[PDB]
Design an enzyme around this catalytic site. Structure first.
Site, PDB file in Angstrom:
ATOM      1  N   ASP A  30      28.416  58.576  66.692  1.00 18.81           N
ATOM      2  CA  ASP A  30      28.306  59.844  65.970  1.00 18.81           C
ATOM      3  C   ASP A  30      27.281  59.824  64.833  1.00 18.81           C
ATOM      4  O   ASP A  30      27.085  60.832  64.152  1.00 18.81           O
ATOM      5  CB  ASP A  30      29.679  60.297  65.460  1.00 18.81           C
ATOM      6  CG  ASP A  30      30.537  60.930  66.568  1.00 18.81           C
ATOM      7  OD1 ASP A  30      31.726  61.239  66.336  1.00 18.81           O
ATOM      8  OD2 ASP A  30      30.015  61.133  67.675  1.00 18.81           O
ATOM      9  N   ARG A  59      33.254  63.306  80.366  1.00 17.27           N
ATOM     10  CA  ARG A  59      34.379  63.226  79.439  1.00 17.27           C
ATOM     11  C   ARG A  59      35.717  63.335  80.176  1.00 17.27           C
ATOM     12  O   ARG A  59      36.551  64.174  79.837  1.00 17.27           O
ATOM     13  CB  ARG A  59      34.283  64.348  78.399  1.00 17.27           C
ATOM     14  CG  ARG A  59      32.942  64.433  77.676  1.00 17.27           C
ATOM     15  CD  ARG A  59      32.668  63.200  76.823  1.00 17.27           C
ATOM     16  NE  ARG A  59      33.505  63.114  75.627  1.00 17.27           N
ATOM     17  CZ  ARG A  59      33.350  63.857  74.536  1.00 17.27           C
ATOM     18  NH1 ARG A  59      32.382  64.766  74.472  1.00 17.27           N
ATOM     19  NH2 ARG A  59      34.152  63.677  73.496  1.00 17.27           N
ATOM     20  N   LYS A  66      37.026  65.480  60.617  1.00 11.33           N
ATOM     21  CA  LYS A  66      37.380  66.363  61.720  1.00 11.33           C
ATOM     22  C   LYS A  66      38.153  65.573  62.762  1.00 11.33           C
ATOM     23  O   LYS A  66      39.164  66.037  63.286  1.00 11.33           O
ATOM     24  CB  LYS A  66      36.132  66.934  62.398  1.00 11.33           C
ATOM     25  CG  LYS A  66      36.459  67.682  63.696  1.00 11.33           C
ATOM     26  CD  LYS A  66      35.236  68.300  64.360  1.00 11.33           C
ATOM     27  CE  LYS A  66      34.395  67.262  65.084  1.00 11.33           C
ATOM     28  NZ  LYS A  66      35.140  66.636  66.214  1.00 11.33           N
ATOM     29  N   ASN A  67      37.668  64.370  63.056  1.00  8.55           N
ATOM     30  CA  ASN A  67      38.298  63.531  64.063  1.00  8.55           C
ATOM     31  C   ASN A  67      39.597  62.849  63.642  1.00  8.55           C
ATOM     32  O   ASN A  67      40.140  62.010  64.362  1.00  8.55           O
ATOM     33  CB  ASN A  67      37.274  62.529  64.593  1.00  8.55           C
ATOM     34  CG  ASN A  67      36.152  63.219  65.354  1.00  8.55           C
ATOM     35  OD1 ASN A  67      36.265  64.400  65.685  1.00  8.55           O
ATOM     36  ND2 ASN A  67      35.076  62.492  65.645  1.00  8.55           N
ATOM     37  N   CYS A 107      30.334  68.319  80.283  1.00  8.94           N
ATOM     38  CA  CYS A 107      29.822  68.188  78.919  1.00  8.94           C
ATOM     39  C   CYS A 107      28.362  67.728  78.941  1.00  8.94           C
ATOM     40  O   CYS A 107      27.996  66.849  79.720  1.00  8.94           O
ATOM     41  CB  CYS A 107      30.676  67.186  78.139  1.00  8.94           C
ATOM     42  SG  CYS A 107      30.106  66.855  76.444  1.00  8.94           S
ATOM     43  N   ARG A 138      31.048  73.023  63.813  1.00 13.14           N
ATOM     44  CA  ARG A 138      32.126  72.330  64.508  1.00 13.14           C
ATOM     45  C   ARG A 138      32.555  71.082  63.748  1.00 13.14           C
ATOM     46  O   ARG A 138      33.687  70.621  63.898  1.00 13.14           O
ATOM     47  CB  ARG A 138      31.689  71.913  65.914  1.00 13.14           C
ATOM     48  CG  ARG A 138      31.643  73.030  66.942  1.00 13.14           C
ATOM     49  CD  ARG A 138      31.551  72.429  68.337  1.00 13.14           C
ATOM     50  NE  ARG A 138      32.576  71.407  68.528  1.00 13.14           N
ATOM     51  CZ  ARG A 138      32.325  70.130  68.813  1.00 13.14           C
ATOM     52  NH1 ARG A 138      31.077  69.706  68.952  1.00 13.14           N
ATOM     53  NH2 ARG A 138      33.328  69.272  68.941  1.00 13.14           N
TER      54      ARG A 138
HETATM   55  C1  LIG Z   1      37.632  64.710  68.733  1.00 11.31           C
HETATM   56  C2  LIG Z   1      37.080  63.317  68.588  1.00 11.31           C
HETATM   57  O1  LIG Z   1      37.721  62.487  67.968  1.00 11.31           O
HETATM   58  N1  LIG Z   1      35.884  63.023  69.153  1.00 11.31           N
HETATM   59  C3  LIG Z   1      35.314  61.645  69.027  1.00 11.31           C
HETATM   60  C4  LIG Z   1      35.894  60.706  70.090  1.00 11.31           C
HETATM   61  O2  LIG Z   1      35.711  61.311  71.364  1.00 11.31           O
HETATM   62  P1  LIG Z   1      36.402  60.651  72.631  1.00 11.31           P
HETATM   63  O3  LIG Z   1      37.864  60.946  72.618  1.00 11.31           O
HETATM   64  O4  LIG Z   1      35.826  61.125  73.907  1.00 11.31           O
HETATM   65  O5  LIG Z   1      36.228  59.093  72.594  1.00 11.31           O
HETATM   66  P2  LIG Z   1      36.600  57.858  73.591  1.00 11.31           P
HETATM   67  O6  LIG Z   1      36.289  56.681  72.773  1.00 11.31           O
HETATM   68  O7  LIG Z   1      38.031  57.990  73.970  1.00 11.31           O
HETATM   69  O8  LIG Z   1      35.707  57.663  74.857  1.00 11.31           O
HETATM   70  C5  LIG Z   1      34.302  57.476  74.860  1.00 11.31           C
HETATM   71  C6  LIG Z   1      33.898  57.141  76.314  1.00 11.31           C
HETATM   72  O9  LIG Z   1      35.116  56.833  77.088  1.00 11.31           O
HETATM   73  C7  LIG Z   1      35.147  57.611  78.278  1.00 11.31           C
HETATM   74  N2  LIG Z   1      36.549  57.961  78.661  1.00 11.31           N
HETATM   75  C8  LIG Z   1      37.429  58.467  77.696  1.00 11.31           C
HETATM   76  C9  LIG Z   1      38.668  58.808  77.974  1.00 11.31           C
HETATM   77  C10 LIG Z   1      39.164  58.666  79.326  1.00 11.31           C
HETATM   78  O10 LIG Z   1      40.280  58.949  79.710  1.00 11.31           O
HETATM   79  N3  LIG Z   1      38.232  58.143  80.265  1.00 11.31           N
HETATM   80  C11 LIG Z   1      36.933  57.774  80.014  1.00 11.31           C
HETATM   81  O11 LIG Z   1      36.184  57.331  80.895  1.00 11.31           O
HETATM   82  C12 LIG Z   1      34.269  58.792  77.986  1.00 11.31           C
HETATM   83  O12 LIG Z   1      33.764  59.336  79.192  1.00 11.31           O
HETATM   84  C13 LIG Z   1      33.157  58.184  77.111  1.00 11.31           C
HETATM   85  O13 LIG Z   1      32.144  57.519  77.887  1.00 11.31           O
HETATM   86  O14 LIG Z   1      35.187  59.430  70.060  1.00 11.31           O
HETATM   87  C14 LIG Z   1      33.741  59.477  70.237  1.00 11.31           C
HETATM   88  C15 LIG Z   1      33.291  58.016  70.151  1.00 11.31           C
HETATM   89  O15 LIG Z   1      33.654  57.522  68.854  1.00 11.31           O
HETATM   90  C16 LIG Z   1      33.104  60.375  69.148  1.00 11.31           C
HETATM   91  O16 LIG Z   1      31.678  60.444  69.359  1.00 11.31           O
HETATM   92  C17 LIG Z   1      33.786  61.752  69.236  1.00 11.31           C
HETATM   93  O17 LIG Z   1      33.223  62.599  68.239  1.00 11.31           O
END
Ligand SMILES: CC(=O)N[C@H]1[C@@H](OP(=O)(O)OP(=O)(O)OC[C@H]2O[C@@H](n3ccc(=O)[nH]c3=O)[C@H](O)[C@@H]2O)O[C@H](CO)[C@@H](O)[C@@H]1O
Ligand SMILES: CC(=O)N[C@H]1[C@@H](OP(=O)(O)OP(=O)(O)OC[C@H]2O[C@@H](n3ccc(=O)[nH]c3=O)[C@H](O)[C@@H]2O)O[C@H](CO)[C@@H](O)[C@@H]1O
Lengths: 420, 420
Positions: A307, A122, A22-23, A117, A399
């Site tokens: 995950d 997020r 999915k990701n 969330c 999902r």
């Molecule tokens: C659609 C998808 O691919 N989802 C995955 C993706 O989510 P996701 O895109 O959120 O993953 P990220 O690794 O980018 O971020 C994780 C952490 O970074 C923080 N953060 C992120 C972006 C930003 O601009 N600022 C910030 O502070 C978030 O609040 C969180 O604490 O990675 C997670 C960690 O592997 C998985 O559990 C999710 O299932």
């Protein structure tokens, strides 16, 4: 509002086919916004989020549909709208990935800011920041992130403040059509980023270092199109391996890519399981043994994936011994623990750490799915608990788990989907 | 699924009546399970949680109803059922308070264990532990906490591991009918605990020290009944005071008890507001001034209440300057920040700390209520934002704010309740 009725006391054994991730499919689908020529995607799971993504795309002017073979045909040659509407985006924070491609190719884009969330904060500040470094002018008005650049984006070195899968993907996507060379330092290394990178390369992009903390991209005029088979889902794979490990069974996952689950596989072996990896399958034989408690510490790839955290909380709760589970990615990703405790599990929570005390047998009862990975953990718990288990808000599983009912049922699970 | 449409750019001024505290009425209602004689409650707000509580009571055999005066008449003389069913309890974790009274008076009780919560972990381990110390035998089976004692409970000294309003109340309730004297050390001091204590005393109980970290209870044979006016809601009061402070207006809260909001009132004054306290009212005059950013650190009463944290996040986001908001009670109680950011606010989150950067004006848009205190904060934000604001899942407010639409409308707010 569907809910699963699961009959416990079962050993889960057999074979199960692993679908595309999915990701990986999600970011690839948004990345297709850069394609000037036809795109064909295979191994794309049928998930709510994929459908929502398709709706967002069509709404931008993209022509896309899944055919009888299951492949997804996509034509982004005539995108004439540049706004991912809140009506749709509010149901899927991943749509934030629509902004990077749109600005890069069309020099303008709009996506609504993320909402609250349950598992944690997020924000998309790193996404916005990365795009600005590339030269994008961003304004936040009316709940929308509005990007605009009077000319082609400009490559540069970007050092992401922290490891972010989302921001790494957004910046990588936009970099593809920027002028010059872009360096994404401290990039996330997740397998889905590598796959998205390969997808982009097939369309002319020039990305190297994907999978490492150092990604180099040489911008180009435009991307064409291609056919791509989505990377197998390591999380789905890890989940079914857990199905066997928690029930004493033996499961074989087909169409896998074992090198994306080293951390998981090693913890499973540490738990007392035997797992054999072939180039296209992964087998886990628990040997009719109760697992041994193991410590867990989530971390960015290639460390233990957040995950898989809920799934391993379940494993440790039925294991023998005490375990320390430390969640370092999100701040409220233990909502599954109280639900599992309702089922007989035992865990003491403190900060981002859960100290579990394994028990021999769980007991069936009513529980509520709070999130995606927690939902499957509760269903699995229901499979090995005594008596009957009812899982509410089961819409969460749809999902990230394709035909989860048939797959589990194919492993010996007795589960009925009813409407309350 | 109702949602509020709020028209922004408004100054909230006027008078508003403060209702009884939800967090006092709830524990008092469950405490009434100990009453052998008629009970009459006044100043009880009309909230979803009160209704759910009534249903739980009737289901136990309690005869109760609200009459034309609004008072709640309750007769618990013939309780013949001792189980707070999951069907109802799953919608209100506060019903955990049904266990203590039932075991104390009837020597048996059953309440289903709590589920996952979006703001943080909400285990009841301290409740169970405290009851066991008092002599209760507890078993967890089928998702239920089943208490039983072959004889009257036995007083003893209990040192609660941490400050817990819920566990303090549960133990205090059970102590009332235990044999001997009970000492609750390191007890929570919240005003709602004092009020519940006074309620119990009126029925014969012997509780002293309520409101301090040292509560002493001399067990007695049984409790009778009484009439009681519920303590004014300090949180509702604090919320409307914020309404004026964030809009430059002037508001007068009627039927208050100012000494329950010292921390809040002092922060409001620190923010540049003038507040005058009389024995039955509290007035806040912002003086048509923009507030000054102030640091916040939630803590158990008498420190700054976590239930006012979202409200103060809003105040600081429109204030002048930078602020540090530290939430020490729950681990995911910042879900309102991203929603507020959608409206133009600015905050950087890290751990249990949010660093806000005040702006002059918010902008109206669509937002989603994630929890009780966050929901009201979004409605209030909508009142002072430019243009129009739409708040979804507004059903959250009805859990703690009686006729919130009329009250706000009475302060100059233009808000319409429609169904999407
Ligand atoms: C659609 C998808 O691919 N989802 C995955 C993706 O989510 P996701 O895109 O959120 O993953 P990220 O690794 O980018 O971020 C994780 C952490 O970074 C923080 N953060 C992120 C972006 C930003 O601009 N600022 C910030 O502070 C978030 O609040 C969180 O604490 O990675 C997670 C960690 O592997 C998985 O559990 C999710 O299932
Ligand atoms: C119905 C009601 O009155 N709700 C209020 C009450 O909730 P609540 O009853 O949960 O308040 P507590 O003070 O008892 O506990 C707060 C903290 O203690 C922890 N904890 C609690 C009990 C237990 O057995 N074990 C344990 O670990 C919780 O996980 C949380 O981290 O106080 C909170 C803090 O003032 C308020 O925000 C709530 O609105």
């Amino acid at each position: 509002m569907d809910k699963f009725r699961v009959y416990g006391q079962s050993r889960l054994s057999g074979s199960v086919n692993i679908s595309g991730a999915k990701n990986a499919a999600l970011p690839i689908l948004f990345a297709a916004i850069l394609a000037t020529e036809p795109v064909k995607l295979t191994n794309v799971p049928e998930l709510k989020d994929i459908e929502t993504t398709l709706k967002i795309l069509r709404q931008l002017g993209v022509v896309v549909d899944r055919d009888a073979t299951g492949a997804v045909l996509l034509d982004a040659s005539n995108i004439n709208h540049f706004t991912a509407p809140y009506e749709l985006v509010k149901t899927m924070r991943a749509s934030i990935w629509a902004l990077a491609p749109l600005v890069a190719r069309f020099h303008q884009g709009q996506v609504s800011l993320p909402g609250g969330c349950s598992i944690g904060a997020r924000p998309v500040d790193l996404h916005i920041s990365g795009l600005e470094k590339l030269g994008a002018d961003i304004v936040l008005e009316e709940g929308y992130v509005k990007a605009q650049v009077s000319d082609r984006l400009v490559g540069t070195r970007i050092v992401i403040e922290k490891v972010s899968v989302g921001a790494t993907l957004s910046i990588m996507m936009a970099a593809t059509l920027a002028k010059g060379t872009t360096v994404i330092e401290n990039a996330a290394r997740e397998p889905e980023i590598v796959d998205t990178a390969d997808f982009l390369n097939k369309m002319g992009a020039k990305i190297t270092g994907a999978g490492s903390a150092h990604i180099t991209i040489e911008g180009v005029e435009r991307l064409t199109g291609c056919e791509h088979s989505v990377v197998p889902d390591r999380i789905e794979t890890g989940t079914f391996l857990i199905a066997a490990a928690i029930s004493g069974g033996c499961v074989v996952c087909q169409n896998t890519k074992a090198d994306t689950l080293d951390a998981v596989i090693d913890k499973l072996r540490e738990a007392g399981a035997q797992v054999d990896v072939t180039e296209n399958s992964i087998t886990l034989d628990m040997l009719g043994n109760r697992p041994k408690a193991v410590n867990i510490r989530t971390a960015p790839h290639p460390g233990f994936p957040t995950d898989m955290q809920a799934q391993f909380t379940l494993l440790n709760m039925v294991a023998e011994g005490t375990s320390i589970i430390t969640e370092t990615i999100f701040e409220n990703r233990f909502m599954h623990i109280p639900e599992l405790i309702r089922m007989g599990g035992k865990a003491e929570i403190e900060g981002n750490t859960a100290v579990c005390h394994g028990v021999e047998q769980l007991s069936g009862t009513e529980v509520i799915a709070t999130d995606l990975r927690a939902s499957i953990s509760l269903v699995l718990a229901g499979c090995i608990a005594t008596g009957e288990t009812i899982v509410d808000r089961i819409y969460h599983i749809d999902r990230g788990y394709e035909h989860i009912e048939d797959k589990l049922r194919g492993l010996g699970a007795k589960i009925e989907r009813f409407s309350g």
